[PDB]
Amino acid sequence: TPSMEDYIEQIYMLIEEKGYARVSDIAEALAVHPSSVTKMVQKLDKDEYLIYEKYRGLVLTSKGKKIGKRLVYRHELLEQFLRIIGVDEEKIYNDVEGIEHHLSWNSIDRIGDLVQYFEEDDARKKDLKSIQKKTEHHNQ
Amino acid sequence: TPSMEDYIEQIYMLIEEKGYARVSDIAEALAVHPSSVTKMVQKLDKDEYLIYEKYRGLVLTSKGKKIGKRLVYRHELLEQFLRIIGVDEEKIYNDVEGIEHHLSWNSIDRIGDLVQYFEEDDARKKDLKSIQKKTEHHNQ
């Protein structure tokens, strides 16, 4: 279920940023009611991905830490790839969050390879910008 | 709703391939029960995208034809882009069907620009293949 991965990624990022994850912050980040957050936390505890205390909080496990690190790496590489082409920053996060769950790992590897190819040379990026402008002249 | 676009694309492709769309073929293509197909057909008829006859069939409208053509163009360009990098053909259709609904049109334009950039030159594709192999040596 993509929701499980989304929650794991959000919890891992929030822990790495703040040092501690809270239910209200997770609910605000995912724009969902805290009751759904509690249900998801209990379900993840049933899956032994994290340890939950009834009124204290949550602590991620080693497997959860690895999954969160991998998901954060995928998210950041997707963001970098989308920014490379020249997409507006407003929709970049929305598109990445929408597509980060339906993509296969082979596609992620291919995207990373493309990013590496376009990062070692700037002339390729300049040519991409030039052809993009010359083809978007119709939108002008 | 992405389901509406998915149904419109499937109906348009089936009409262009066979010359006529049938409920059983749509249900088999989308792997859903024919009752759901009937419900979706009635809902789309409520949206004036196609004309439905109680026991005869469906006929697409001009607006429906344009939407289907645009969606088919997006789908085929996504397939070509995914095939360009070198992803396995088995997962290409699944990934395209999963991501064809959550992507913005600007991202589609950027993907088309990248495909055009990589299509005018084969040396770039050869260098991409070489760097892909040199970086996937770790998987060997």
Add this chain to the structure above:
Amino acid sequence: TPSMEDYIEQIYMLIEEKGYARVSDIAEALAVHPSSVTKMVQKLDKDEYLIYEKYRGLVLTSKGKKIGKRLVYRHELLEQFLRIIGVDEEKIYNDVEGIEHHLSWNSIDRIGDLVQYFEEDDARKKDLKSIQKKTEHHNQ
């Protein structure tokens, strides 16, 4: 066989009007049992005029499309010719359907030439109406 041409014309007209031909509609149009319609469809499929699918339907071919277009042109020109003289509309369709199969193409060309001759001038049609009334005074 005139029945083959009649079926081809009916199928072509029904496809051009509705966008799809169904067995029940053809049977109702030709006032024959659907079993005879199925037999005729199979026989026409044996003649490679159309492609038939066991439970889906029928799709006309390019040769079938040309034959249907020619037959529809002949039918409409016959209807126009019969309406020009002043025959009652009730029997026009019956007479056209009865005589559309036993006429030669040269006769069709002559009828079209006569229609063109009487269409470029209205005084000729007025004189025809006047002489028709003056000769049908005996029926009064």
Add this chain to the structure above:
Amino acid sequence: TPSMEDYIEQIYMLIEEKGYARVSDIAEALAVHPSSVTKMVQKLDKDEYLIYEKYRGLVLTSKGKKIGKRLVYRHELLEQFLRIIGVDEEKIYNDVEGIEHHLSWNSIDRIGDLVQYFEEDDARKKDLKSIQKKTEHHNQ
């Protein structure tokens, strides 16, 4: 049944031409086996249109004479109408025999009126010939 009228017309014409109708002559004229001719003769005798003697021959009745005269008048007026336009004499008889049974009497009256209209003036026929040539220039 058109076959009854066809047989009555043929018998009436043969009697008026030769003075006596024979089974072999009727069979040759209608290009059918004499057994079918005998069956038709017996059926017409059942309809009291003519008197048949077992080995002697056939004699038409007053009603049969009137029907034959009317049918011969229709046939000859159809032949004259077809010859007026300029159709080749080879197909004139075939077309007249094919269409003499499916036409209504009102259409026959209209054809006779048209023949009368085109017979009182020769300038109309000359103009028809001129426009026919000018439009058949494409066939040249």
Add this chain to the structure above:
Amino acid sequence: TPSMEDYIEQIYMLIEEKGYARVSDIAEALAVHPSSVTKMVQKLDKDEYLIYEKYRGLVLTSKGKKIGKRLVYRHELLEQFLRIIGVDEEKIYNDVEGIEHHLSWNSIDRIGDLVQYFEEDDARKKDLKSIQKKTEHHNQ
């Protein structure tokens, strides 16, 4: 030759009664073998009184029609004259057939005049019957 006139009269009467003359009917009427009938038909054809077709039949000519009409008139007036006096009907036809060939036309005119004289008045016929009875009393 009286046989020629007899055959012409029989053929004319048979044509006027049946509408067509056949060899078997003529042979039965004249109580002669059909071979003699064929010989007589060929001889009459040599005299250009009628047209004969090898297996079809015979058709009388205008001269033959006039001769037959005159002979039938003579025969019927002879029958009426013989019936007027009161001869038995059984021998009337035999006597008329026996004497219709040896009589001159002036005698025929005189017989017709006598018939006209006895037809305008019935008292003369009544007196003839009375004197016939009074003189045939010896036969009683």
Add this chain to the structure above:
Amino acid sequence: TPSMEDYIEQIYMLIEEKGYARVSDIAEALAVHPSSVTKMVQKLDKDEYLIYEKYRGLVLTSKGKKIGKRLVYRHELLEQFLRIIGVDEEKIYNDVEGIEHHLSWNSIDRIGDLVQYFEEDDARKKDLKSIQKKTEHHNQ
């Protein structure tokens, strides 16, 4: 056979006129070759109507005499009847000789009765002559 009666009548009349019958006279009277006369004489001798001697001649018998007398009476009454009406004397003998063999005895009795009726009164003959002239005015 009428020839037998004709020969008997001729022989009886010749015997009553000359007193003796000769072969040459009979042949001249009947306009036939003497060989046929000899054959007929031998045949009649076979019928025991007359006695013939090889080179002498013929003598009639009592039965032959009665038959000849009856035939002569019939011939003379026929001649008188034909002369009564007013037929030309030239054709009277020819007609009587032609019709004296095909008539029945009852017809002879009726003719004799008519002759007796017209002989007792001359006013009837005068009226017959008057009506004959008034009806033969058309021949004038």
Add this chain to the structure above:
Amino acid sequence: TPSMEDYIEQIYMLIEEKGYARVSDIAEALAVHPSSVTKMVQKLDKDEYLIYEKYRGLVLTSKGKKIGKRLVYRHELLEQFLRIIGVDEEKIYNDVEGIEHHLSWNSIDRIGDLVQYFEEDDARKKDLKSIQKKTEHHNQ
């Protein structure tokens, strides 16, 4: 103030054990009302030893981490030193918590040196136990 060091040590130990410090747990550990805990947390935040969020929680700083590590080392070495001599475990924690704040660092170094001296040899500990028993015989 010894209270500041006590709170820092408790927070550091609780964070190292649970991964996150909560106000209720600190209050229970120090057996004080949560209002005093909030006051102490605010005062420590004023001293820039930790970062406090109004309703989220507390996170220690690098200086706070070093101070907590040093205090935990002192506490554990005091516990080990007290256990070495043979004091009852019930009062060991109470005595260590009572004396961990009034001792100088030089005294801590001397205690650690004594622990190291008595840890490298077990005969010294055995002699200490023997003399302890021989002198505590008076308590028996």
Add this chain to the structure above:
Amino acid sequence: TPSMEDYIEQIYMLIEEKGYARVSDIAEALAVHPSSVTKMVQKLDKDEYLIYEKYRGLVLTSKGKKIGKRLVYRHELLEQFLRIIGVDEEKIYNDVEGIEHHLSWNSIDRIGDLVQYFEEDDARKKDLKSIQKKTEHHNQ
């Protein structure tokens, strides 16, 4: 309350040294205002540990004498124990005064046993000094 024991010990030591305890001397020794000294004296008089006269002075009781003797013995043994290890004399009195109230009597017995163990042999003290120097080489 440790303050009661501290005051009793100070009063006992001052009486044993000077022969008489005065309020000013006690206040100077404990570095507190004489008002607090008067309050403490009144409170101790309420506890029947000493007899106080309104302007004369204080006299200890037998129970007070025993408590003071025991506390002085504990203080002197603590001083000797701290001096044995080699702590600087400047902080020895401060540390002893700080820790003389929070220690249990069993700990005091253990400290006395350790002092007796290290007093019967000087080689142990020499080895302690040697290991102390060898481990404090890092401070050099």
Add this chain to the structure above:
DNA sequence: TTTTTAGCATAGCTCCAACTTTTTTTCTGTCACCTTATTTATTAGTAAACAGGAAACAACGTTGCTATAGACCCACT
């Protein structure tokens, strides 16, 4: 003259209780999807009434083909 108490006056410190955000726990309704049942267009035989041709057959109509008579000639008695 100093020392020795007796209030006088501020102080954070700690606690109690009220207050005000935050976390869980059922409670309550909802669209999603599966399953079932019903209804109706689509085929595949399935049998029966014919239409017409083939073939066979039963009169009809015809061409010699010769038997028997009625003129016609010629020679003979």
Add this chain to the structure above:
DNA sequence: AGTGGGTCTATAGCAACGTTGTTTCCTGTTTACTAATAAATAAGGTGACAGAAAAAAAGTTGGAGCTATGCTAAAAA
């Protein structure tokens, strides 16, 4: 002048035969019909999935005592 023995065709059964008109089969050939068969439609049941609404705790805050020093003298050896 009257008779007998070859010729000359005319007329008439008759005798196949060859056709013409009738009858009887066959033989596809088309037309209602009747299951059966899949395809299309409508009706029900669970069932996750949020709101939402208490409740239950947690975290905050505003105050009220409570000692703990620091003044400032008034009294006593």
